[PDB]
Coordinates of N, CA and C in Angstrom, one line a residue:
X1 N 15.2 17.9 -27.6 CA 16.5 18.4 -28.1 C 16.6 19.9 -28.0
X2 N 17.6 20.7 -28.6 CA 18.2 21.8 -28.4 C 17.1 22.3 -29.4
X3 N 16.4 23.1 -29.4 CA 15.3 23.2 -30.0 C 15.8 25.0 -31.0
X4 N 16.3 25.8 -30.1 CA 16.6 27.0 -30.3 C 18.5 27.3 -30.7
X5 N 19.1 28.1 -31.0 CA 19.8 28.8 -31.5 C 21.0 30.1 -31.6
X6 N 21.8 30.4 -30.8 CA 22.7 31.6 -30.7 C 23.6 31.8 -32.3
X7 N 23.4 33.2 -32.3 CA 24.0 33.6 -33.7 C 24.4 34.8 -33.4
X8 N 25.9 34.6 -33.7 CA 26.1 36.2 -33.8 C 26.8 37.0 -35.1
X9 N 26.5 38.1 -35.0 CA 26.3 38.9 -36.7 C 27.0 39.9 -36.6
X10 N 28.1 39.7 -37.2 CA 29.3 41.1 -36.7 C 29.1 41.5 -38.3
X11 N 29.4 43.0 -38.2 CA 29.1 43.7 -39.2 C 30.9 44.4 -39.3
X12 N 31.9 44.3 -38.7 CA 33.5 44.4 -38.5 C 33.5 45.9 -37.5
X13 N 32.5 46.1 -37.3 CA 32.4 47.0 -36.2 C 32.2 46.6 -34.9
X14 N 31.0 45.9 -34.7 CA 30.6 45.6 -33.6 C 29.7 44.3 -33.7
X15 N 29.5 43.4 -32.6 CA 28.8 41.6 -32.4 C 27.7 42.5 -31.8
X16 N 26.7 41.1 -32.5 CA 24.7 41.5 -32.0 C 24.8 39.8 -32.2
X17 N 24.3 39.5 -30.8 CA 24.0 37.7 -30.6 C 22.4 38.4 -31.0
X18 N 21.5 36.7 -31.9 CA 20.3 36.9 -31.8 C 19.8 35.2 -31.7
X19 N 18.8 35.3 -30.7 CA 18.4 33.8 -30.2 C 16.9 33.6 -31.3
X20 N 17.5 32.6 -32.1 CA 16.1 32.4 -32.9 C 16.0 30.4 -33.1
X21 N 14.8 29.9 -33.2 CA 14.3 28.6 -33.5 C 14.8 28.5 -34.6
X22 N 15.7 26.9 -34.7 CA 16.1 26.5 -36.0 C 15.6 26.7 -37.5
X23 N 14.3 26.1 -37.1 CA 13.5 26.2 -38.2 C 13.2 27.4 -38.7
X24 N 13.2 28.4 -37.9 CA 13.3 29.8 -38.2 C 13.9 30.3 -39.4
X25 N 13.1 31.0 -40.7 CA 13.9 31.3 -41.9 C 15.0 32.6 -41.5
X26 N 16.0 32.8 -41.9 CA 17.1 33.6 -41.6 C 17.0 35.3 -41.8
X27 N 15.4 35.1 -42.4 CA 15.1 37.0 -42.6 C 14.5 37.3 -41.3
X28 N 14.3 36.6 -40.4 CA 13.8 37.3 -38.9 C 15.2 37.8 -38.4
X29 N 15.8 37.2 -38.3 CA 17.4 37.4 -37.9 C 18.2 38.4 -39.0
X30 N 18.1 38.4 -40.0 CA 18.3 39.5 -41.1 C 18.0 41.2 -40.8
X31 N 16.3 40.8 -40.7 CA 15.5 42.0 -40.2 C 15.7 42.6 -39.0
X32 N 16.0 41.9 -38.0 CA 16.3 42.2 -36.6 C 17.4 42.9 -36.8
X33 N 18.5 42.9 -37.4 CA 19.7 43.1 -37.9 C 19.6 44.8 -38.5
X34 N 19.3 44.5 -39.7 CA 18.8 45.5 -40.9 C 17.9 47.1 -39.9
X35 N 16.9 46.5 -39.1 CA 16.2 47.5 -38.6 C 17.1 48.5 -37.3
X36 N 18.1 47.6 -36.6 CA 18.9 47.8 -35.0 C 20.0 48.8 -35.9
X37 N 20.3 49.0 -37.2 CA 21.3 49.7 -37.6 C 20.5 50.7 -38.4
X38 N 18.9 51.1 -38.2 CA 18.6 52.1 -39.4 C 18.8 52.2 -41.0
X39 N 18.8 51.0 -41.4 CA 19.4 50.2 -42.3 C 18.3 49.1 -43.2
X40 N 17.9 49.6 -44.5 CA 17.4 48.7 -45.2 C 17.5 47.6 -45.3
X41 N 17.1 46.2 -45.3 CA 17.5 45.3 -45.5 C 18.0 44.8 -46.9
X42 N 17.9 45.3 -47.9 CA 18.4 45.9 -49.4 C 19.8 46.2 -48.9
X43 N 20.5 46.9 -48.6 CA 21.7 47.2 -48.9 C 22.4 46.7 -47.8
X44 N 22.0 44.8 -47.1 CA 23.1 44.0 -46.6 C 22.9 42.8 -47.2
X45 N 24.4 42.4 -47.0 CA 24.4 40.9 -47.8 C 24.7 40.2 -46.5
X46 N 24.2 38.7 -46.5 CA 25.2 38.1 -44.7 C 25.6 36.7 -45.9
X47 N 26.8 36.7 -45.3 CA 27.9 35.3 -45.5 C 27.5 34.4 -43.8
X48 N 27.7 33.2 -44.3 CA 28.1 32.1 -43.5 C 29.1 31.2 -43.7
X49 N 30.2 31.4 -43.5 CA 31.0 30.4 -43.8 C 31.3 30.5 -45.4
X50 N 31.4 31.8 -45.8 CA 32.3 31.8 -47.3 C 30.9 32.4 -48.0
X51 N 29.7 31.9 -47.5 CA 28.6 31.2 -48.5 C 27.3 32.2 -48.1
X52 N 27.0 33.0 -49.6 CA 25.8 33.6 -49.3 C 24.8 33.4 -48.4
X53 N 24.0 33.7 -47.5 CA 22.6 33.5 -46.7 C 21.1 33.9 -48.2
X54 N 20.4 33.4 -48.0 CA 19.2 33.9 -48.5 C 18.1 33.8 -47.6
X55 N 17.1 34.3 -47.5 CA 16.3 34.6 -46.7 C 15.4 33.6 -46.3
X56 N 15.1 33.1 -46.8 CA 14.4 31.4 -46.8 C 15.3 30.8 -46.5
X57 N 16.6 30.1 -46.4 CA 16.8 29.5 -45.4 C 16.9 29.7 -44.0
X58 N 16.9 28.2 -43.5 CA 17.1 27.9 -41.7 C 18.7 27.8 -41.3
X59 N 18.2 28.2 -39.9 CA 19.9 27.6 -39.4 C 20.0 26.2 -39.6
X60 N 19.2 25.1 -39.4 CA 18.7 23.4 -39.5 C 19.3 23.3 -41.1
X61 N 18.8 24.3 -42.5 CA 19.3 23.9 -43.6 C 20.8 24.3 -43.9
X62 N 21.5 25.4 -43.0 CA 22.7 25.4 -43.7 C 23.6 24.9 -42.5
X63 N 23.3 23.7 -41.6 CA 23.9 22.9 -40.3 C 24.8 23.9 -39.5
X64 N 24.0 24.9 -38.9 CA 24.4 26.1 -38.2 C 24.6 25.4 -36.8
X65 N 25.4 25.7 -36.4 CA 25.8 25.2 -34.5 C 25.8 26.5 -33.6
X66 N 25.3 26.7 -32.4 CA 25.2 27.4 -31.5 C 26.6 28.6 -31.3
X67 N 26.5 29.7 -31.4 CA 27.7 30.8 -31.4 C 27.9 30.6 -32.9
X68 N 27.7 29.9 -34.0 CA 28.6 30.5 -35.6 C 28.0 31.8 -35.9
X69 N 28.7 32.6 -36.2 CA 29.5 33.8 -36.6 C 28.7 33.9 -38.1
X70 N 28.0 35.1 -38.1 CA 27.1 35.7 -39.6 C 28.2 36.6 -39.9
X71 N 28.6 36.9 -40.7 CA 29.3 38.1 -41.4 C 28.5 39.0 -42.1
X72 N 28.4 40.5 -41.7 CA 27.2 41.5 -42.3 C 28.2 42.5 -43.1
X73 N 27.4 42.8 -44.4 CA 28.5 43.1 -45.7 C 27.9 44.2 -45.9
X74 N 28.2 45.4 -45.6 CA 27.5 46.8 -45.7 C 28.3 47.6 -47.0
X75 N 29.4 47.3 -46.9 CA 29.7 47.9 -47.8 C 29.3 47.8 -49.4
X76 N 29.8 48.3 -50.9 CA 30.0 48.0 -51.9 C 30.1 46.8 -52.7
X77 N 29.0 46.6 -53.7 CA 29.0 45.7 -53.7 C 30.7 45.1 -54.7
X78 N 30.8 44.2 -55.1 CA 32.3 44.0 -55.9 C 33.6 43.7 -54.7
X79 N 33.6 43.8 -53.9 CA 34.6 43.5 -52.6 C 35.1 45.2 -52.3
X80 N 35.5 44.9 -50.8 CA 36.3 46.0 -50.6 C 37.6 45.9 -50.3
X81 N 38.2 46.9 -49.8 CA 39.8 47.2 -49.7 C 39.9 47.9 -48.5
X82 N 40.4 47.2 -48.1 CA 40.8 48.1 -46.2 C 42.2 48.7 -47.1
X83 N 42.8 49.9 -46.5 CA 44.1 51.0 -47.0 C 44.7 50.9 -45.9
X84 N 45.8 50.7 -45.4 CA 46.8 51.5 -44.8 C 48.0 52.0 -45.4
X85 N 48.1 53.0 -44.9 CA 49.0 54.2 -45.0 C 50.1 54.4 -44.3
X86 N 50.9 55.2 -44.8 CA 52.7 55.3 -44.3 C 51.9 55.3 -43.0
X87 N 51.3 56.2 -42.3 CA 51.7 56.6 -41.0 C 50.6 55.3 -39.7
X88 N 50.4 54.4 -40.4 CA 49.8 52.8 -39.9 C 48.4 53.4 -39.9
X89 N 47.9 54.4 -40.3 CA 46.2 54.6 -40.1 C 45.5 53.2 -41.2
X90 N 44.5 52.6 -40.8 CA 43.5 52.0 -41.8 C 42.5 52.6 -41.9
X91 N 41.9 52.4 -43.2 CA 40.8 52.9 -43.8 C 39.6 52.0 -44.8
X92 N 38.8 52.3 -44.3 CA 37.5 51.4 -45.3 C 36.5 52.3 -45.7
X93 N 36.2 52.4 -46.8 CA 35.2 53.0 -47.4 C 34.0 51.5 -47.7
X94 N 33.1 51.9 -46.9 CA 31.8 51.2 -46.9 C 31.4 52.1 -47.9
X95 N 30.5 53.1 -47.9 CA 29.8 53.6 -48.9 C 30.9 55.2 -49.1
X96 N 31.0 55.2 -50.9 CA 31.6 55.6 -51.8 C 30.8 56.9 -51.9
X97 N 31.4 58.0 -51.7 CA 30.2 59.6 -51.7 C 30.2 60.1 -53.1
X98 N 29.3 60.5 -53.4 CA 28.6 60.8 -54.8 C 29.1 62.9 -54.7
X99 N 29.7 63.3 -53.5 CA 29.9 64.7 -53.6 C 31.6 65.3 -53.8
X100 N 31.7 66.0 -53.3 CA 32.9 67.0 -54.0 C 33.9 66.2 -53.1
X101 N 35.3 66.2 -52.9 CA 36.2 65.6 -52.1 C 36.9 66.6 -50.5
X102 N 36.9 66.3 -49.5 CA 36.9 66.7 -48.8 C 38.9 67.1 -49.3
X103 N 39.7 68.5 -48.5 CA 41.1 68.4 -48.6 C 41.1 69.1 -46.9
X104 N 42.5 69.2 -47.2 CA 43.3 70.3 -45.8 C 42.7 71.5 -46.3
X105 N 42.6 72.2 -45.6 CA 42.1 73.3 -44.9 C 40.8 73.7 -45.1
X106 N 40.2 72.9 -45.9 CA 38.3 73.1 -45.9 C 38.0 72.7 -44.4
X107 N 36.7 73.2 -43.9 CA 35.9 73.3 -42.8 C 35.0 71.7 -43.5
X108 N 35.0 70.8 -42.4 CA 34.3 69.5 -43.1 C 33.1 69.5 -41.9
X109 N 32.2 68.9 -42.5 CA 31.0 68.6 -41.3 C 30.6 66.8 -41.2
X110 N 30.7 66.4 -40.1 CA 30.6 64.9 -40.2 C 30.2 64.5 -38.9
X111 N 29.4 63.2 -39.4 CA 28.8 62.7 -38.3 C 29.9 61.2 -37.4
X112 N 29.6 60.6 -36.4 CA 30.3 59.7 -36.2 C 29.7 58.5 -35.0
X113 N 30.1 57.7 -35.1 CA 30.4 56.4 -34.0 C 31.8 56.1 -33.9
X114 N 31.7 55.8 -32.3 CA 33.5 55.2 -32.2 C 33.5 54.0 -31.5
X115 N 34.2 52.5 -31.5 CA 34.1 51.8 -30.6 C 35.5 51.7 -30.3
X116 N 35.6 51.0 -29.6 CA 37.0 50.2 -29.0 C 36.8 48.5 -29.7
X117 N 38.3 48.2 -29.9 CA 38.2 46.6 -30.9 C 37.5 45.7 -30.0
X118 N 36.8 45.8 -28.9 CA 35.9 44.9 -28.0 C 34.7 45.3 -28.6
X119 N 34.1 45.6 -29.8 CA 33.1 46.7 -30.2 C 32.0 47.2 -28.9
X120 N 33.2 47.7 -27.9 CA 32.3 48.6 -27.0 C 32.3 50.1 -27.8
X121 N 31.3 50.7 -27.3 CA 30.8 51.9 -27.9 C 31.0 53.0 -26.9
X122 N 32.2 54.2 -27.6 CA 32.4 55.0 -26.7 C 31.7 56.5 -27.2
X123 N 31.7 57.0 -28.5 CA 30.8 58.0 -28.6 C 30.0 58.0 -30.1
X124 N 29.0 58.8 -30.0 CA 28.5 59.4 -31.2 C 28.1 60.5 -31.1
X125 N 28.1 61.6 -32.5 CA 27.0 62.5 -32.8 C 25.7 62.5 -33.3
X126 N 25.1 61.3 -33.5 CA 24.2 60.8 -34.0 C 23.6 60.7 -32.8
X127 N 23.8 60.3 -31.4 CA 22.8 60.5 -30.1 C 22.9 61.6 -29.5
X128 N 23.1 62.7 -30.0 CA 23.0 64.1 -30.1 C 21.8 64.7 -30.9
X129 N 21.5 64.4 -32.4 CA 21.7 65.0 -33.2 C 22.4 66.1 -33.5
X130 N 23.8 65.9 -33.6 CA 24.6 67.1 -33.9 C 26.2 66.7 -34.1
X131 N 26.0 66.8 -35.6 CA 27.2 67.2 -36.5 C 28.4 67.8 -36.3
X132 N 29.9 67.5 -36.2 CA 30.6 67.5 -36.1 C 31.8 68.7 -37.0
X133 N 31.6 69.6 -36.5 CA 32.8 70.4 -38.0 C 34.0 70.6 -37.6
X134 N 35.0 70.1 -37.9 CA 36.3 70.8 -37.7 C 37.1 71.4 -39.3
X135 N 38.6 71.8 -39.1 CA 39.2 72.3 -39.6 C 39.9 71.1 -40.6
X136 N 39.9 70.7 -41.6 CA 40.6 69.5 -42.1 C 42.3 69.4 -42.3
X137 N 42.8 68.9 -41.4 CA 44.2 69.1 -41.2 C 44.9 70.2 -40.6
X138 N 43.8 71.0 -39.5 CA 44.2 72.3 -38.9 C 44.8 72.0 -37.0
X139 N 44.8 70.5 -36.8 CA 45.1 69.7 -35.7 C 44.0 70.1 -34.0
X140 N 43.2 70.0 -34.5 CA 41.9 70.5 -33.7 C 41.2 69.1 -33.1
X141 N 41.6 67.8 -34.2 CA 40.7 66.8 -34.0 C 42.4 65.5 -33.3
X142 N 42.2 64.5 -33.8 CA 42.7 63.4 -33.2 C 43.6 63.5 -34.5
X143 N 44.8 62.6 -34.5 CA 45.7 62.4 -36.1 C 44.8 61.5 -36.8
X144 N 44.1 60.1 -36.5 CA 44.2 59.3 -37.3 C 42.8 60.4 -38.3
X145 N 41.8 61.3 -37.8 CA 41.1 62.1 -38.3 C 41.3 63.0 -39.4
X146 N 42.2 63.9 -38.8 CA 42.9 64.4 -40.1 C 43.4 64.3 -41.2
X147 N 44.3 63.0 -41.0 CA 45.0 62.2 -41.9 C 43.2 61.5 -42.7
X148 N 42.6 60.7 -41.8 CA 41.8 59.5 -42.2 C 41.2 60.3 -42.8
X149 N 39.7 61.5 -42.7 CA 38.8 62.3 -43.3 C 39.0 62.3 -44.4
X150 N 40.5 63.1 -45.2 CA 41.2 63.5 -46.9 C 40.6 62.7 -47.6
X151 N 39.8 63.3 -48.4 CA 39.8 62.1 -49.7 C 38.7 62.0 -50.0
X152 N 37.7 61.9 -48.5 CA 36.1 61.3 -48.5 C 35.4 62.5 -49.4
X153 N 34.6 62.1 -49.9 CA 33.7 62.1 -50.7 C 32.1 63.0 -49.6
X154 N 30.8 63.8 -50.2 CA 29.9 64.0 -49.7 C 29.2 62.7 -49.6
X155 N 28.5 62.0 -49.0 CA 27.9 61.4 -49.1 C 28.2 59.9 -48.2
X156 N 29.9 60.2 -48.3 CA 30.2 59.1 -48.0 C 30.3 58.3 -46.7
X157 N 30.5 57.0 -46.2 CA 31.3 56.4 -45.0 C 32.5 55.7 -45.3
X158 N 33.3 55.6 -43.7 CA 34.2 55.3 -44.3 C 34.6 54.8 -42.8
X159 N 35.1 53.8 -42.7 CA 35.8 53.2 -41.3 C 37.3 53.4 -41.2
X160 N 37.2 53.9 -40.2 CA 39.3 54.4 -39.8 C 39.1 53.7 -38.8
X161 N 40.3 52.9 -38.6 CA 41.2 51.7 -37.5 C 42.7 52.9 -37.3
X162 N 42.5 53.4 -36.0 CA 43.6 54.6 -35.8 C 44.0 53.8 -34.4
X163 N 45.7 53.5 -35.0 CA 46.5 53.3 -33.9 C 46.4 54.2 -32.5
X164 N 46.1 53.8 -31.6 CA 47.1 55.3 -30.7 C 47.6 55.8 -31.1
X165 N 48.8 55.9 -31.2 CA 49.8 57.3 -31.4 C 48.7 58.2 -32.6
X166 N 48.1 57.5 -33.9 CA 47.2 58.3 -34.1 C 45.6 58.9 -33.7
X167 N 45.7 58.6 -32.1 CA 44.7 58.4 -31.0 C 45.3 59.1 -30.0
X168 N 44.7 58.8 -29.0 CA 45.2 59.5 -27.6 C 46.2 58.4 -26.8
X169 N 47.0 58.0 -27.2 CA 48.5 57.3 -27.0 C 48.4 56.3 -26.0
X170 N 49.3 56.7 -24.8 CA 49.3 56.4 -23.7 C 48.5 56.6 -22.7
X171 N 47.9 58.0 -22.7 CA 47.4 58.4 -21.7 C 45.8 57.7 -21.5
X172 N 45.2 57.6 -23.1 CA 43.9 57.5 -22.8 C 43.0 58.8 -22.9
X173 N 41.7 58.8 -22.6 CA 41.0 59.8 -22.4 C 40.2 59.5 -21.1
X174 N 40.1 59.8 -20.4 CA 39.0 60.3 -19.1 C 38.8 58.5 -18.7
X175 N 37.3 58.4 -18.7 CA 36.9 56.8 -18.2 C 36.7 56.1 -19.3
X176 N 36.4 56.5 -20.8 CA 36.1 55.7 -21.9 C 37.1 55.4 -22.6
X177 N 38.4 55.8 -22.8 CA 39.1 55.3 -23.8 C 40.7 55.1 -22.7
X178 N 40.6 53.7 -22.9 CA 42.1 53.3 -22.0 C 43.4 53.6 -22.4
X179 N 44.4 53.6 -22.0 CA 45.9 53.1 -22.3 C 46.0 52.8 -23.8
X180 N 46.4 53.1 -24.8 CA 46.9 51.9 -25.5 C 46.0 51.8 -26.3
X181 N 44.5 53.0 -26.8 CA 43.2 51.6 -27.4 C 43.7 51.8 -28.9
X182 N 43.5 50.9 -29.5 CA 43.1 51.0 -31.3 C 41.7 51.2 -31.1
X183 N 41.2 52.5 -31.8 CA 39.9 53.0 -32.2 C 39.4 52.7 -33.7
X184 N 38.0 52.1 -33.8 CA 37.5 51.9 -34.6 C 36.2 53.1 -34.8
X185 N 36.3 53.6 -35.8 CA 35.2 54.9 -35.8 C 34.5 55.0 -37.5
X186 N 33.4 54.9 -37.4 CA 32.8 55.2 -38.4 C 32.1 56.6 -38.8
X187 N 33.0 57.0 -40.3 CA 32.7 58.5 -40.1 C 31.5 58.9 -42.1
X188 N 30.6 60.0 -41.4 CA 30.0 60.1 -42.6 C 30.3 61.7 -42.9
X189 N 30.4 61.9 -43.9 CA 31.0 63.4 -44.6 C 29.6 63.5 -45.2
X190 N 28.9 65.0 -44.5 CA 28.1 65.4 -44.6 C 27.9 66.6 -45.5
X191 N 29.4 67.8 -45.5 CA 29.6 69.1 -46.0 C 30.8 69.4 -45.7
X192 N 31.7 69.6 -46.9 CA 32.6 70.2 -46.8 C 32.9 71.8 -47.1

């Protein structure tokens, strides 16, 4: 019989398929997870179907079928709250910053990842090493940026869902970002 297993583990950013044996307890697949994001395995939770995972269980114990869908919970524990705003930006605060609050016209320093809603991956400053500073609200960066940044916290992350028009619209940018994209970008406030 089908001896083995496809799973894939979206974290609302981006899908990771991982091929593991039924029998297999679910922290190989956890870990694989946890370690591919530089990421504790402490600060994720995974849902299946509504319903906690724990690490001792198998795909065989909670009657897992080939392609079901892990949900990976990075954020806060207590639920979160996606925000949208007058001007259609969304906003998620995964992790809540413990520092001073970023406003307009402070110089902010921040790191980032951006995908497109196919969680293809168009940039980072993290495969640099090198931090990002603009002007906050001084129109240097993208809108949904300006607008999205306000508010964050030192310390913190925060996922912005920026329409085009608060993106690069119609035109696109160069060969990475098409016509038309909704950009998903995860941003950390480093210094304001």
């Amino acid at each position: 019989p089908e001896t083995h297993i496809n799973l894939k583990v979206s974290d609302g950013s981006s899908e990771i398929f991982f091929k593991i044996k039924k029998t297999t307890p679910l922290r190989r697949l956890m870990e694989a997870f946890a370690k591919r994001q530089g990421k504790e395995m402490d600060s994720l939770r995974f849902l299946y179907d509504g319903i906690r995972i724990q690490a001792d269980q198998t795909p065989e114990d909670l009657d897992m079928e080939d392609n079901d869908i892990i949900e990976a919970h990075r954020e806060q524990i207590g639920g979160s709250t996606v925000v949208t705003t007058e001007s259609g930006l969304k906003y998620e605060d995964l992790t809540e910053g413990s520092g001073a609050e970023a406003r307009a016209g402070q110089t902010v320093s921040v790191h980032y990842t951006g995908w497109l809603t196919d969680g293809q991956k168009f940039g980072s400053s993290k495969d640099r090493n090198d931090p990002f500073a603009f002007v906050l609200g001084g129109g240097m960066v993208i809108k949904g940026w300006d607008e999205g940044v306000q508010g964050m916290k030192v310390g913190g992350v925060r996922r912005l869902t920026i329409p085009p028009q608060l993106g690069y619209g119609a035109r696109g940018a160069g060969g990475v970002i098409p016509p038309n994209a909704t950009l998903v970008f995860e941003v950390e406030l480093l210094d304001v």
